[PDB]
Amino acid sequence: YFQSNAMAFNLRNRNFLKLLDFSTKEIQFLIDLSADLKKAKYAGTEQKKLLGKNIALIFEKASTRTRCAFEVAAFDQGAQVTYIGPSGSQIGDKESMKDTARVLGRMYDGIQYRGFGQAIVEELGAFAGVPVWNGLTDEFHPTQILADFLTMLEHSQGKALADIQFAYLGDARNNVGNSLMVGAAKMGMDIRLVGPQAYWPDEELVAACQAIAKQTGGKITLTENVAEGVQGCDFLYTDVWVSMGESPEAWDERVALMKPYQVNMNVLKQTGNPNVKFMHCLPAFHNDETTIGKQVADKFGMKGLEVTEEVFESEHSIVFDEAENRMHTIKAVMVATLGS
Amino acid sequence: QSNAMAFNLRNRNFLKLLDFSTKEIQFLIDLSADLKKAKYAGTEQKKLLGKNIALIFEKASTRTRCAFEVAAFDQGAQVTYIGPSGSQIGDKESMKDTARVLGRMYDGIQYRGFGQAIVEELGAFAGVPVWNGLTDEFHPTQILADFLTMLEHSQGKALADIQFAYLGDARNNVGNSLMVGAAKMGMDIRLVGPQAYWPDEELVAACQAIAKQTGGKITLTENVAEGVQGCDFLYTDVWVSMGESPEAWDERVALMKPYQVNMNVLKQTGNPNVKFMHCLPAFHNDETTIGKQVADKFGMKGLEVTEEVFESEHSIVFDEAENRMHTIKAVMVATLGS
Amino acid sequence: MAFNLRNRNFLKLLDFSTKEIQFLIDLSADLKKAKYAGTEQKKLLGKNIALIFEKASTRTRCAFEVAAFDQGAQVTYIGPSGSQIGDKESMKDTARVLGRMYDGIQYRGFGQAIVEELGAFAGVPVWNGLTDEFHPTQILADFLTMLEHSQGKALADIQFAYLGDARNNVGNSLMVGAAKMGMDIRLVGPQAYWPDEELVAACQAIAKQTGGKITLTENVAEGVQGCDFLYTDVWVSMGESPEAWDERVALMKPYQVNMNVLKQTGNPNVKFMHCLPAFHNDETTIGKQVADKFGMKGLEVTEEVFESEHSIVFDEAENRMHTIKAVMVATLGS
Ligand SMILES: NC(=O)NCCC[C@H](N)C(=O)O
Ligand SMILES: NC(=O)NCCC[C@H](N)C(=O)O
Ligand SMILES: NC(=O)NCCC[C@H](N)C(=O)O
Ligand SMILES: [Cl-]
Ligand SMILES: [Cl-]
Ligand SMILES: [Cl-]
Question: What is the C-alpha to C-alpha distance for residues C271 and C269, in angstroms, rounded to an integer?
Answer without folding.
Answer: 6
